[PDB]
Design a protein around this ligand. Structure first.
Ligand code: BOG
Ligand code: BOG
Ligand code: BOG
Ligand code: BOG
Ligand code: PLM
Ligand code: PLM
Ligand code: PLM
Ligand code: PLM
Ligand code: PLM
Ligand code: NA
Ligand code: NI
Ligand code: XE
Ligand code: XE
Ligand code: XE
Ligand code: XE
Ligand code: XE
Ligand code: XE
Ligand code: XE
Ligand code: XE
Ligand code: XE
Ligand code: XE
Ligand code: XE
Ligand code: XE
Ligand code: XE
Ligand code: XE
Ligand code: XE
Ligand code: XE
Ligand code: XE
Lengths: 445, 445, 451
């Protein structure tokens, strides 16, 4: 007999995300190794190294091992606990009721001690049920950490490429600006220009030059995040992170059925497991409303004289059946039961919150990614127009048919447009990461 | 007697906030349902729904129940703990003292077991005092969560309106810029224009177009945050969140006496409660320096033969008065007492820190709100001048009395001014939230 | 005898930071009171007030005392625990074995009760070894908090000066802009200007005016962070924070040998101590594979009649030697051992992660600081050219040889350049803080014979 509530997984409705029945997405398959679709061998090597080197991941494997070991101890409580012991009780004094003389008093015991709770109401079955569930929670915590780590690492590689891309855009615009500064000097020196043109050109050149070490600095913080995520020291990175293009995915994104997301996400499973364990804990406490039946035992040797221990004349056995019940202390048992009920309500609510946070993450990731595609189309147009404008403004300044401010302003806009477009490409890549993170991709799924 | 210190709430001086004798503020009343002053029924519905749906709030209620359950168990220790038992000791072997033959031996007991610590030094009174205080702390944690949740939600609604406001500003500027692009093409096509004007107009149009999906993306993240704060899935959100104006409060802000803030804030009460509990815990530990006086009992039946249990010939009673005192183990008792004293100093320091954090939050909220009002006055002036400038620049460009860059730049400034003004209005709304959060507004007892 | 693994500090290689062999840095000495290099008495007073008033620091000191007190209780388990008792047993009923009559029964005891676990396999020595290490971890947590707090406070002072600097730049640019607005009005009113010029001038003035209360607002948030970090209420600040220059260090930075950073960082020591404690806990669990030997005792008086307690005829004593061993419960003991092994692997990995996070912080702080110096050189050039451009554009606008946009744009760029430069100066100062934070500056490593 196993008292208290029988846990049932909640009847959690599947995710509905309408925005996913469109062209950017392929619901017909899900790609578990979602980062491989970027077709970037360097990224793939980063991820592989991270799975064997990351120290947080190592901690989580260890915690999983700890939880199994806890469970394994609790499972032995289903059986009698048979220990060994050699003891004595030696003294001199009165023996009240028997005599008022001070007599010597000796007793020796050697053998097996047995302690056994008969699990008639399932206190122990429930403890094991809880511990098994906490083991499964720990496995899910590990899987979630893997999902989180892969996403963080892929994202950081993106940021690194972004900084590299933007540095290259900044240096390229710096050269255009150097050419222009040089033209303002030439015109001024030939008597058909102005110091005012050279000054403004210098100021703009220095502004653009100032962005370079900023961008390099962000690249270096990203390289350094990557090294830690790999379990590697900053100066000991194995993998060559020299500049390459920001990866892209041109096929529609294999996102599977978004209805499956709540079943795929390990954080959801972890919190469901904790709910199951907490529900079993109600059982544990509920069992204390009923009597506790135990059976102690001794098998070995008992004697008044040490010499006899081990011999036939000292053979002994004893059996200690016991039934106890809280009786007038039932109020206390009820208080602990209320406590366990409260903890299980906490766990339920906490599970529900994770479900909601997960649906929120996915809804954001999909809404973002679609908008980021739209935005990019406009930014690409801005860049094209800007490049063309600055080209023409350069020709006109050179020829004497437009003021320097026209060229200055067109150059500012070209840089500003090309930079924003790159940032937006990085955003798109990061949005891909957020989608897969939110779907629970990357643990074996 | 009740040993150890008698807790007294610290004499914490009232908050002094001088900036509040200004006319932005009404110290003559405080409005508990502070969000209702925005006169936004949609906001009011959100708040009411969140109080019944939010899952973090559910967790906190459950933790409150857990703490009451702990307290209820402790309270029973003021009374004797009277449990029930049926036991036996059955076996064969020597009986030291009595005989060296291996004899059969039986003993049966059935009745009530009684255990009572008498509480002469108040160890138990103090345990209960601590537990009651931790219950009040848990109630205050819940109330603080209510304050935090309401503030987060109101703030998020503000962000949502902000994104919607800014989208509308971006679309309105997009129309002006579309008209301009069209004018540059027209003038070019009519032989009094230039390709360079069309290109720059295209670039600027695309830039403005690009901002729209960004702002929509932010609107969607805010919609989704609102749904979770309500305890709802994103696609189930009941409330119509289609655009409306960012709410405003035109009367002076009813902020009450700022010297009441520390009494109103539940976080301060929670930390004060934990301090009270920790002070009682010093009492608990201090009691262990004194003797512990207890009284055990048995009432029921005892017999050498199973047959007799229940009969008057097996009636039994016993009574076990006992006094113990740590004696040579006083060093251990002292170490635990030092430990409890240390924990109480931690709690005191931690209470003081919450006081300081609260005064910091308050002082920031008031400093900010005044500055945000000032800043807005300038931004409103900037917007007006900018719109006028761009209107006139458009007239002049069309007429042939100013270059396109003059119109371009005036259009950029109009958008930049109108968007900054909107952001600043959002800031002002959020400043209102920060004031009320910091004053401890919005909780139920 | 002491059982289970004998802890050894891991053989952690020294930090390698190559970028530190260059001339921004002086590796020949380290300054532990690293903020004093700024030669700012106001900053020095803030830091001193913080060390005596900050409440987080007080919390952490208290937690350190709690952990020592826990350890002191555990230490007494190496010795017999000798308590005292006065008790009685009174009742009426059968005495199984002896009689089936219901007899009256009385008994009185007064004396010393003794309990002693003899630490033959070191279960207790190991518990103490763990507890001592957890105390050292708490000491190191406190020291790390001190490092973090000092850094936070110095950083905040920098942000405060930054806000004050930028306000001053904004007001100064506001004055230039007022002069220009006045010129647009004059030219318009004298028949050779344009309303369009006055309107754009007005818009820009309002933009610049709008920045002032924002910057003042940041100054006030900073003042308030500083007050809490000092343990002070916002309106009760002891130190005068009225505007002064952002401090600067002209000497190359005394950063010592970066290969001594992992030894100096308290967070690294804290994690190493938790590793040591965890390793000792393996010992504790390993001891349960062996027998446990105990010895109980009683010495005092026992009697059937209350009157006799205290007299020679009621003298009593007993001794309770005992040895137990898990026997068929060894699988449970093994499960606990595997558990403790798992926790020690967790702790090792956690120690290693802290090492890596520390190397990452250090490497970022040095990469940043170098880059921030370079960036500043360019921003200074931008400011100079911009100031000059705006002067010339003003001359040309006055002449009737440009539209006002030329002057407007030059003025925007001047403000934008001077503001960016100031932010970048603040960045450099904050990068100094990040270096010292990451090196473990601001606590006293050689205090307490070190260990
Ligand atoms: C008056 C004389 C009485 C004689 C009684 C027999 C003595 C018991 O002596 C016993 O001998 C064993 C080996 O033989 C040992 O293993 C036991 O531990 C020992 O105590
Ligand atoms: C208060 C915690 C630290 C004090 C350590 C010394 C013991 C203090 O114990 C004191 O002695 C008396 C006992 O009857 C009582 O009257 C006091 O109220 C009690 O607290
Ligand atoms: C009333 C009968 C009890 C016998 C005397 C009690 C001994 C109390 O003595 C205690 O021993 C502690 C640790 O060993 C010492 O540190 C304390 O100074 C002392 O309080
Ligand atoms: C683990 C050894 C027991 C140590 C108790 C030592 C108490 C002193 O702790 C000290 O406090 C200061 C701030 O409060 C820190 O700067 C010191 O570095 C720290 O050692
Ligand atoms: C809920 O109360 C269920 C109680 C179940 C008791 C189960 C006992 C199983 C042992 C079966 C052995 C049969 C003969 C073998 C003798 C050792
Ligand atoms: C759970 O208790 C519900 C009641 C119905 C289940 C029946 C199980 C019968 C068990 C009898 C146990 C007595 C054993 C005592 C040995 C010392
Ligand atoms: C100091 O001397 C304390 C004063 C209070 C009396 C102390 C004795 C125990 C009080 C517990 C209250 C309920 C006990 C009822 C017994 C059935
Ligand atoms: C391992 O088997 C332990 C052997 C137990 C023998 C008893 C030792 C008597 C105590 C010596 C005192 C030394 C003090 C050092 C304190 C760290
Ligand atoms: C310290 O002195 C080392 C003692 C040497 C060991 C012998 C003690 C016998 C007790 C039985 C322990 C069995 C361990 C089982 C593990 C697989
Ligand atoms: Na109780
Ligand atoms: Ni020390
Ligand atoms: Xe044994
Ligand atoms: Xe330029
Ligand atoms: Xe930088
Ligand atoms: Xe047994
Ligand atoms: Xe411009
Ligand atoms: Xe019972
Ligand atoms: Xe019984
Ligand atoms: Xe029994
Ligand atoms: Xe809420
Ligand atoms: Xe435009
Ligand atoms: Xe976007
Ligand atoms: Xe005593
Ligand atoms: Xe500090
Ligand atoms: Xe201006
Ligand atoms: Xe502001
Ligand atoms: Xe700050
Ligand atoms: Xe012993």
């Amino acid at each position: 007999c196993t008292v208290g509530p029988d846990y049932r997984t909640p009847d959690t409705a599947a995710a509905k995300i309408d925005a996913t029945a469109s062209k950017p997405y392929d619901r017909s398959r899900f790609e578990s190794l979602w980062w491989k679709q970027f077709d970037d061998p360097t990224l793939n090597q980063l991820v592989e190294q991270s799975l064997s080197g990351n120290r947080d991941l190592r901690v989580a494997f260890a915690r999983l091992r700890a939880a199994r070991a806890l469970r394994d101890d609790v499972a032995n409580d289903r059986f009698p606990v048979v220990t060994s012991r050699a003891s004595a009780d030696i003294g001199k004094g009165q023996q009240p009721g028997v005599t008022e003389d001070r007599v010597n008093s000796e007793r020796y015991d050697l053998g097996l001690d047995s302690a056994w709770e008969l699990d008639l109401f399932g206190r122990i079955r429930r403890q094991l049920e809880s511990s098994d569930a906490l083991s499964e929670a720990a496995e899910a915590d590990l899987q979630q950490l893997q999902v989180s780590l892969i996403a963080e690492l892929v994202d950081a590689y993106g940021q690194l490429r972004g900084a590299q891309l933007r540095e290259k855009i900044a240096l390229s615009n710096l050269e255009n600006q150097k050419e222009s500064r040089q033209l303002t000097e030439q015109l001024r020196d030939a008597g058909v220009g102005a110091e005012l043109d050279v000054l403004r050109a210098d100021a703009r050149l220095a502004a653009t030059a100032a962005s370079v070490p900023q961008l390099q600095a962000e690249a270096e913080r990203a390289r350094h995040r990557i090294a830690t995520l790999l379990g590697q020291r900053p100066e000991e990175l194995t993998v060559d992170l020299s500049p390459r293009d920001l990866p892209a995915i041109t096929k529609a994104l294999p996102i599977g059925d978004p209805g499956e997301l709540l079943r795929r996400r390990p954080d959801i499973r972890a919190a469901e497991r904790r709910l199951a364990a907490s529900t079993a804990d109600v059982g544990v406490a509920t069992a204390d409303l009923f009597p506790r039946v135990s059976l102690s035992g001794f098998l070995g040797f008992t004697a008044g004289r040490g010499s006899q221990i081990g011999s036939s004349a000292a053979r002994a056995w004893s059996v200690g059946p016991s039934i106890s019940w809280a009786a007038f202390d039932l109020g206390s048992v009820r208080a602990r039961l209320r406590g366990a009920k409260a903890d299980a309500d906490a766990a339920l609510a906490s599970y529900e919150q994770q479900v909601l946070l997960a649906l929120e993450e996915s809804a954001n990731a999909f809404s973002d990614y679609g908008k980021r595609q739209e935005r990019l189309v406009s930014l690409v147009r801005q860049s094209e127009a800007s490049r063309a404008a600055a080209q023409q403004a350069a020709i006109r300044y050179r020829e004497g048919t437009t003021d320097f401010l026209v060229l200055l302003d067109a150059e500012r806009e070209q840089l500003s447009a090309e930079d924003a477009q790159a940032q937006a490409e990085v955003e798109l890549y990061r949005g891909i990461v957020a989608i897969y993170r939110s779907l629970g991709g990357g643990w074996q799924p």
